[PDB]
Symmetry: C3
Subunit: 117 residues, 3 copies
């Protein structure tokens, strides 16, 4: 899986180790091996949500066949929201998630793609 957290919060205001905790949370929420989860945090960007620029964040979740249905994404969202709101000290209205399902043929590792690994 790939998890990206983009926020208008400055790096300094972002809880140390958030990437680690988020890595773990992801593996659990999506039920994928922790050591294959990639976390990326882009802090200090300019963000506007609900015509407001108070602190807020976007969470992008990309994974293979686990985020392709409103069914499971609802469950995921709940978990992630619970995680982020807590960690970042933000209210639900200041967090949005986007799920992108992927396929092994589009993921490249060790000079090839998942498909041949």
């Amino acid at each position: 899986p790939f998890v990206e957290l983009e926020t208008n919060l400055p790096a300094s205001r972002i809880p140390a180790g958030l990437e680690n905790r988020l890595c773990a949370a992801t593996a659990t929420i999506l039920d994928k091996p922790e050591d294959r989860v990639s976390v990326t945090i882009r802090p200090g960007m300019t963000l506007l949500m609900n015509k407001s620029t108070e602190p807020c964040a976007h969470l992008l979740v990309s994974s293979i066949g686990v985020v392709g249905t409103a069914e499971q994404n609802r469950t995921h969202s709940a978990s992630f929201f619970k995680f982020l709101t807590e960690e970042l000290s933000l209210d639900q209205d200041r967090i949005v998630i986007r799920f992108f399902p992927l396929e092994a043929w589009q993921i490249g590792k060790k000079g090839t793609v998942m498909t041949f690994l």
Copy 2:
């Protein structure tokens, strides 16, 4: 909708309130409620366009069923281009747009997904 503007222009060189104006422009161009439009600006990144690193920008537009056909995207592009070129003081050749259609099941809000809202 989700609008992301990534540029090699420094934050300082980016017109104050651009996110607000872009938020409004988006709602109009795509005909979606203004209060549900998310704008993100990543300034000061390294960008190369046409083997050149002079100022330029990328606009990413994600929305539900309104950017899925060359038909409507042509209309959108025209509007967005008119907006950006003006605002950013860039020529057409220094701006590129990418449209990504989305589906409520992949958008998470308030601990669930659009699908159940």
Copy 3:
């Protein structure tokens, strides 16, 4: 094509001209005109890979009908990996690639979309 390199390496530690060289490498690897290749580099972001935050990078490759099959992506990956590992001084285990196929109708240029150009 669109190539994005996101890394936890600081801008200063990123080899001067990397975008240019990467632009060229892309055109070659994907066999698309060099002057239509867009390169973006986001340095100094927070990245965790294999539960580790040592230097690492993500490469996102978006293009029209050339990165849609494990077949060709394997070839691409090999090339890109060879390029990045070399340039960035990173081992294979610290680089991940993601391929996103696109369609002219979703790419906007000169106030319209590729489709009408």
